[PDB]
Design a protein around this motif. Structure first.
Motif, PDB file in Angstrom:
ATOM      1  N   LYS A  72      18.015  22.506  76.769  1.00 40.67           N
ATOM      2  CA  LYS A  72      17.154  21.756  77.691  1.00 40.67           C
ATOM      3  C   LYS A  72      16.606  22.621  78.810  1.00 40.67           C
ATOM      4  O   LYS A  72      15.430  22.506  79.182  1.00 40.67           O
ATOM      5  CB  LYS A  72      17.904  20.580  78.304  1.00 40.67           C
ATOM      6  N   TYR A  73      17.492  23.434  79.379  1.00 40.07           N
ATOM      7  CA  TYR A  73      17.199  24.235  80.557  1.00 40.07           C
ATOM      8  C   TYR A  73      15.872  24.971  80.416  1.00 40.07           C
ATOM      9  O   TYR A  73      15.099  25.050  81.364  1.00 40.07           O
ATOM     10  CB  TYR A  73      18.316  25.244  80.792  1.00 40.07           C
ATOM     11  N   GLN A  75      13.401  24.107  78.157  1.00 42.17           N
ATOM     12  CA  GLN A  75      12.354  23.119  77.915  1.00 42.17           C
ATOM     13  C   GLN A  75      11.857  22.452  79.188  1.00 42.17           C
ATOM     14  O   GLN A  75      10.759  21.912  79.222  1.00 42.17           O
ATOM     15  CB  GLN A  75      12.840  22.064  76.930  1.00 42.17           C
ATOM     16  N   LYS A  76      12.683  22.459  80.226  1.00 40.19           N
ATOM     17  CA  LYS A  76      12.307  21.817  81.477  1.00 40.19           C
ATOM     18  C   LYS A  76      11.097  22.529  82.082  1.00 40.19           C
ATOM     19  O   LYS A  76      10.283  21.921  82.779  1.00 40.19           O
ATOM     20  CB  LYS A  76      13.486  21.821  82.439  1.00 40.19           C
ATOM     21  N   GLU A  79       6.603  21.577  81.097  1.00 41.66           N
ATOM     22  CA  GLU A  79       5.667  20.809  81.877  1.00 41.66           C
ATOM     23  C   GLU A  79       5.388  21.451  83.219  1.00 41.66           C
ATOM     24  O   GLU A  79       4.272  21.386  83.732  1.00 41.66           O
ATOM     25  CB  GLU A  79       6.230  19.390  82.088  1.00 41.66           C
ATOM     26  N   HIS A  81       6.416  20.802  86.137  1.00 30.64           N
ATOM     27  CA  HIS A  81       5.937  19.612  86.881  1.00 30.64           C
ATOM     28  C   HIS A  81       4.442  19.316  86.712  1.00 30.64           C
ATOM     29  O   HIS A  81       3.793  19.027  87.710  1.00 30.64           O
ATOM     30  CB  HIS A  81       6.292  19.684  88.369  1.00 30.64           C
TER      31      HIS A  81
END
Length: 82
Positions: A72-73, A75-76, A79, A81
DNA sequence: CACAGTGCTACAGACTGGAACAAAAACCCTGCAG
């Protein structure tokens, strides 16, 4: 004529125990094989481009790189943000 | 004597410091010259 003495394992399974399952779990498609299965695709592109490649080492590196792909780390940051 | 790689390894190359040497650059200078 086609269902007298024979039925596919699935037509039976899907016409019988599904209400019981979704009563028990509440979900089926979420528990589907896809996550595994689909994943195989990646394995292939990891056995070609990111492989070592010799029989001794390469599974180690396919494995490692896979683990990184699915974290996940990382993949964050996609985007970022938006 | 196909060729772009295949990751992680190997340690090759890139760094400091004073201590001092030398060479070279481009000024000022004084020297010996019409």
């Amino acid at each position: 004529y086609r269902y007298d003495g024979k039925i596919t394992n699935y037509l039976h399974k899907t016409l019988a125990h599904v209400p019981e399952i979704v009563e028990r779990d509440g979900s089926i498609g979420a528990w589907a094989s896809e996550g595994n299965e689909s994943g195989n695709k990646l394995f292939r592109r990891f056995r070609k481009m990111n492989a070592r490649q010799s029989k001794t080492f390469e599974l180690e590196d396919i494995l490692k790189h896979h683990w990184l792909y699915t974290s996940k780390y990382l993949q964050k940051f996609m985007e970022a943000h938006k």
